[PDB]
Amino acid sequence: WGYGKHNGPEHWHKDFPIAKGERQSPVDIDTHTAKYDPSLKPLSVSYDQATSLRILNNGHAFNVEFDDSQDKAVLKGGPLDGTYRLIQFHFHWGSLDGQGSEHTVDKKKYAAELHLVHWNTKYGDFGKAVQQPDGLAVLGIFLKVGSAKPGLQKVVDVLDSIKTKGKSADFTNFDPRGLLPESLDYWTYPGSETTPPLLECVTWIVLKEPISVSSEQVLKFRKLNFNGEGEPEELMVDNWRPAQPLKNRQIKASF
Template identity: 35%
Template sequence: APLERWYSGLHWGQQVRPGVPGRSPRGRLEVGVPRRGIQAALFPAHIGPAPDPEDWWSYKDNLQGNFVPGPPFWGLVNAAWSLCAVGKRQSPVDVELKRVLYDPFLPPLRLSTGGEKLRGTLYNTGRHVSFLPAPRPVVNVSGGPLLYSHRLSELRLLFGARDGAGSEHQINHQGFSAEVQLIHFNQELYGNFSAASRSPNGLAILSLFVNVAGSSNPFLSRLLNRDTITRISYKNDAYFLQDLSLELLFPESFGFITYQGSLSTPPCSETVTWILIDRALNITSLQMHSLRLLSQNPPSQIFQSLSGNGRPLQPLAHRALRGNRDPRHPERRCRGPNYRLHVDGAPHGR
């Protein structure tokens, strides 16, 4: 493809200084693009430090007049991100229910909190609304398709500029207003998220879809109430929260669909077991409006909404979709303990 040829000579080098972490923003861009006009078009004159190559990506190709690689370019600008362009098990995907294989032997999902309330930091990363749990208590998920216990690393919220078009995944070609992703790493095999993200059976992401309605999920209400959400209006704003009951995020009963995929952000590592909860949550239109007022920039820069922070759909190809509910009989309600979240050893119900 022409774009691939244009980028064939583009590579990154990094300055390494004593005491400076490898991910610090001190990257150095080395350009060897064959056609001189392409460099000028894609990389206008830049004053100031070069961007960190490990962090130089966006969901939009143009930010305030500067080119920043959007999803079509992720796999071209950094060799470590090549899977974003050539991977065969990429995420997100459109789930066609007729392709879901019913697996009656999938056990229920299990959440372990040690009986403690969750606490951590709500953070505007400039790309997502992110909740980073404190080191204690440790929150683990297991069961379902997972062979190992996975530790919660981050809760991430993605949403759109309009209702019905904010989730990364779709069900039968239908999107949702938002998607909550609970990102975990395999703590039984790997010591940290970074090692797990590069390794087989490394990560597990639970996704819950969100609609706009007259009521609101109780867990999301804690995150999205006016006193909280206005504390993270701009990039790098953070606010500490405590006494959160993560089990309240989940529907009282639900089924799930699982498949093998990738991170939906660079480096697009294909080490993720995705678990999609098949019953959507609700938030109010006012809460969604508050999300859309969050800026992906610091206050010193022009406002640009955080909305539209999802990767486009990727081909499912021949990957298997498995579910614990028979899609041939959608009228059947989820009944019994297999369709409830098990919290610290017991089925959860409100």
């Protein structure tokens, strides 16, 4: 599976038939059919005791991994019942600045999208959590191209260390708070992981307020490679899944 002509999203259904299931992500957020629900609590993002461990290029994107052995960085509040542990975060980006996001907002596509993944602590570990309809919660953040994001620069600089598939680099003392927008106003809906196994286990929480990063900061994203070392060069660009049919679902807004 990958994002190419022969192994791209329009083919993942053959090994992963859940690709055309019931609650698949991403989706277009139509802001006028989004149901403002005033029973939706504010988000409680507690990320001040976060331990980042490392960064690694896994062939389809890079993941800053975190130590989820204790509630150090947790997400609760909003639509969530219970505490969800931060395990890792990654982006999806495009080859140009008019594509990149997975989720769109009135069919508009932004330059990229940050996903901070969290698993429900009721289930003991991430592994058991994806056996559950409420196992995961992914906080989604849109990136637009403008002024540079200060807090994004440590990530951008490490990317030469992990140019190719399989590479890693110790990456401690990274504080994820530096990537959060000013406002925690979100849209939320039942969905899925957007990369195989496409498990229908995610409560998505997409923020309304994009962060901006600079054009030179996102250029560095597009230098990475899909391919392993000593293999033909495949630039890691456009690693996003097209929007899926909302099928029944209604998207709520906290605003």
